[PDB]
Design a binder for this molecule. Sequence first.
Ligand SMILES: Cc1cc(-c2nc3sc4c(c3c(=O)[nH]2)CCN(C)C4)cc(C)c1O
Length: 124
Amino acid sequence: MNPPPPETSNPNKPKRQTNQLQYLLRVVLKTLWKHQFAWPFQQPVDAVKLNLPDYYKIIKTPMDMGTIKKRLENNYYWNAQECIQDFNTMFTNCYIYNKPGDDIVLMAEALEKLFLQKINELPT
Ligand SMILES: Cc1cc(-c2nc3sc4c(c3c(=O)[nH]2)CCN(C)C4)cc(C)c1O
């Protein structure tokens, strides 16, 4: 058993764009998603199939770019900060679980640099 994936639809929430949320989807997510190091982050960590028996012991808030993509596409987030918080969680999870020398960590770090390059140019 893996946790259910995070919720991605918010049925009773009305649709509202913001400049920031449009930027997060069309610029930030789009750039990260197509990067060559995206693939370990494109879907929830399957701790069963990946054989990480301690993964949910260590990680209390699973998060991934597949979930973030869908939340953005579904206008799940009320604001840009919620979305940014999910990216931060995703990277945090990687850095607190994996060993510092691991390729997955260096991949995360490459992605996070890009995320931050782009979040620095965020609109308001
Ligand atoms: C320990 C750990 C494993 C992974 C990880 N590896 C793979 S390998 C693999 C996947 C896949 C995946 O999700 N996630 C999913 C399907 N294919 C792309 C095979 C990701 C992170 C962030 C992590 O901290």
